Design a protein around this ligand. Structure first.
Ligand SMILES: *[C@@H]1O[C@H](CO)[C@@H](O[C@H]2O[C@H](CO)[C@@H](O)[C@H](O)[C@H]2NC(C)=O)[C@H](O)[C@H]1NC(C)=O
Lengths: 49, 32
């Protein structure tokens, strides 16, 4: 199994929720489990990141 | 500064290369 910060292409069958913002939540992005306030950001990621 | 374009998990054990030219300019080669 390749584990990297690059875009994932194989995933387990976990159902995606909606996205909730400006509120404290227990998130998981492609297996990236954490906890925090998700909010829209002016950080212009390059298209490969 | 050069961003990525491509990655190939293609398993070649490389030692050599060349460019290709189109006909009916200059190029430069360095090492890492
Ligand atoms: C990768 O391919 C090369 C051939 O293209 C293999 O051979 C090279 O390395 C060997 C290491 O023992 C040398 O014995 C060979 O003389 C050498 N050949 C050339 C032309 O450079 C190499 O073994 C391959 N890699 C692995 C890990 O086996």
């Amino acid at each position: 199994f390749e584990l990297l910060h690059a875009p994932a292409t194989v995933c387990g069958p976990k159902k995606s929720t909606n996205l909730v913002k400006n509120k404290c939540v227990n998130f998981n992005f492609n297996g990236l489990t954490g906890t925090g306030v998700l909010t829209e950001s002016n950080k212009k990621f390059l298209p490969f990141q | 500064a050069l961003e990525p374009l491509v990655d190939l998990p293609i398993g070649i054990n490389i030692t050599r290369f060349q460019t290709l030219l189109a006909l009916h300019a200059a190029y430069y080669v360095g090492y890492l």
